[PDB]
Write a protein that binds this DNA or RNA. Structure first.
Length: 90
DNA sequence: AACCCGGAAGTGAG
DNA sequence: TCTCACTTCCGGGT
């Protein structure tokens, strides 16, 4: 199961708002509220130990080059999706 | 600190 | 066996 899909799933469920949430969902900008908590949930999702935010965020950086995600410059823990799930699956 | 960066190479899963 | 999508490590930067 893919990082971008898992991120969209958490964003779609207000139960996870203490981990991650939309900042401006019209612009698809999201905030990682608890980067360590988020990495822990992701490692759990993939059934593997020793996942960290340093490691998860590296995986997010690969998405920059794939034009799936951009960092919001100078705004800590703020990112945006450049694509919808439909668009990513194309 | 706590986060952000992208190259290089390693690896679970299917 | 082979590919994919990360994972792991790194040396930096902010």
């Amino acid at each position: 199961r893919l990082l971008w899909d898992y991120v969209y799933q958490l964003l779609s469920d207000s139960r996870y708002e203490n981990f991650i949430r939309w900042e401006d969902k019209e612009s698809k900008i999201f905030r990682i509220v608890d980067p360590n908590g988020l990495a822990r949930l992701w490692g759990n999702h993939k059934n593997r130990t020793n996942m960290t935010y340093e490691k998860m965020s590296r995986a997010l950086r690969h998405y920059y080059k794939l034009n799936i995600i951009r960092k919001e410059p100078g705004q800590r823990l703020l990112f945006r999706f450049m694509k919808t799930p439909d668009e990513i699956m194309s």
